[PDB]
CSV table of C-alpha atoms in Angstrom, one decimal:
chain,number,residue,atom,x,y,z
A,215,UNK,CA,-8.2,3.4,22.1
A,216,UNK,CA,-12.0,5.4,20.3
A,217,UNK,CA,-10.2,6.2,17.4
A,218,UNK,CA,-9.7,3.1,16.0
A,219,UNK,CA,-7.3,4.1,12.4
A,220,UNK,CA,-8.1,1.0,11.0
A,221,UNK,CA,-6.7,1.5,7.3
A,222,UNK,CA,-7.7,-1.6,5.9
A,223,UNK,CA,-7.3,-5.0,6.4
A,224,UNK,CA,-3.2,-5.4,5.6
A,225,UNK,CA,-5.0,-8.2,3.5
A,226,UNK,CA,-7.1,-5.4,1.3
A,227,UNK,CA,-3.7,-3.7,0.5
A,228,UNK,CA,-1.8,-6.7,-0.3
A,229,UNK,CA,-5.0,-7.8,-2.8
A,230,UNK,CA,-4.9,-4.1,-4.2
A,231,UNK,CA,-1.1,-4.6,-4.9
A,232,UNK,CA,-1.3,-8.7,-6.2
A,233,UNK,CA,-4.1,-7.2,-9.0
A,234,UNK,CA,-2.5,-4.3,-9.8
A,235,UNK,CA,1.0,-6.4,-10.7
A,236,UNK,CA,-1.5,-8.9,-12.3
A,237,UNK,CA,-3.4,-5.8,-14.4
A,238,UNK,CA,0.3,-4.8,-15.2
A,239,UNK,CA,1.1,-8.4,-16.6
A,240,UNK,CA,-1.6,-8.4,-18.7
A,241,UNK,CA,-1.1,-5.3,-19.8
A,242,UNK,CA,2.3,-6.1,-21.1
A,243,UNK,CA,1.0,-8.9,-23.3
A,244,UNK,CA,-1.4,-7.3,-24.7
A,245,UNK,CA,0.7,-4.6,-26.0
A,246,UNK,CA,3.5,-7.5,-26.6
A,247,UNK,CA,0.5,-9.3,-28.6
A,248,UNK,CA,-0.9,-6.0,-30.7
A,249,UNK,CA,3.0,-4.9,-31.3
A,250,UNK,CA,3.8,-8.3,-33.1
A,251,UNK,CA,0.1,-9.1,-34.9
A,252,UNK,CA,1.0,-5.0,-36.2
A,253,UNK,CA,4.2,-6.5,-37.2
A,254,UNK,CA,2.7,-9.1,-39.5
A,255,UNK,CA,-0.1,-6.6,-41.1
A,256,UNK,CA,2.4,-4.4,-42.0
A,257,UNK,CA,4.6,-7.6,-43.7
A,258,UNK,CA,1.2,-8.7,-45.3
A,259,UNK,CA,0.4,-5.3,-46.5
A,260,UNK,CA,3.9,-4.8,-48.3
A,261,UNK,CA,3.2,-8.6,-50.1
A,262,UNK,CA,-0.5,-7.5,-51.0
B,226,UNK,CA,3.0,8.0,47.2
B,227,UNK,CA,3.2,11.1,45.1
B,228,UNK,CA,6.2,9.8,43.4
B,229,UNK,CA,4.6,6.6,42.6
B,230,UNK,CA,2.1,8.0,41.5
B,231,UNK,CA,4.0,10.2,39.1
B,232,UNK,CA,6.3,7.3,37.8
B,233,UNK,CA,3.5,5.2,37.1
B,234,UNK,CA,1.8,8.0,34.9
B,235,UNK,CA,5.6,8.6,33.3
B,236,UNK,CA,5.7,4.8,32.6
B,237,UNK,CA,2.0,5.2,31.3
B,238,UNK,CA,2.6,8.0,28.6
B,239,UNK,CA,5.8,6.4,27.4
B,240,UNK,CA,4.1,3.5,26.4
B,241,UNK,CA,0.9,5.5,25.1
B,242,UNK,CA,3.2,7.3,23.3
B,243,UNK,CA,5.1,4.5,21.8
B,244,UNK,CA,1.3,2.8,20.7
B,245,UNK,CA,0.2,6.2,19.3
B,246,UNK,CA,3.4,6.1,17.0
B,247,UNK,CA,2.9,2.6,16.0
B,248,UNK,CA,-0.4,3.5,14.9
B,249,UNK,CA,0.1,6.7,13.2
B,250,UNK,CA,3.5,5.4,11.4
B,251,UNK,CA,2.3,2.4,9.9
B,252,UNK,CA,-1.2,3.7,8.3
B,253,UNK,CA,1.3,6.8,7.2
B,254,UNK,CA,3.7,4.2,5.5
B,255,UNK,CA,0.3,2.6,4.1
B,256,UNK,CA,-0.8,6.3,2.3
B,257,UNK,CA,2.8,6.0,0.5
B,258,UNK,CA,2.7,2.5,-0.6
B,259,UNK,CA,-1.5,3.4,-2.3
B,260,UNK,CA,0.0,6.4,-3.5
B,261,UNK,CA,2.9,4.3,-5.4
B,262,UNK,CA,0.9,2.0,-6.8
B,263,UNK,CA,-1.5,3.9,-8.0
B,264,UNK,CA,0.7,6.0,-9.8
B,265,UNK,CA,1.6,2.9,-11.5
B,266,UNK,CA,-2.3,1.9,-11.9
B,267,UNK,CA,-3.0,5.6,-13.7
């Protein structure tokens, strides 16, 4: 019954998961983001 | 009475049993899923 295996509340891993698909997310738009702004230094640096 | 006895303890550990794997299982299906993801984290 005394071991209790209480591995969390089921609410702890579904937070864990909901912020790790939201770090993810903004993880891809900042790489989206830095890949085009590297885009237009390059264009501005050939013009220069 | 010995029998009934018996049954009733058969009956008993069946369902223990059953509890124990219910317990065990889904923390052990829990390990997998944090392992998974953080994979993906790292």
């Amino acid at each position: 019954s005394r071991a209790c295996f209480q591995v969390g509340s089921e609410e702890e891993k579904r937070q864990l998961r909901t912020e790790s698909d939201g770090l993810h997310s903004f993880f891809l738009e900042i790489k989206e983001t830095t890949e085009s702004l590297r885009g237009e230094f390059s264009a501005m640096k050939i013009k220069n | 009475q010995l029998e009934n006895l018996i049954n009733k303890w058969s009956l008993e550990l069946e369902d223990q049993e059953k509890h124990f794997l219910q317990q065990a299982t889904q923390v052990n299906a829990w390990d997998r899923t944090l392992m998974q993801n953080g994979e993906r984290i790292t």
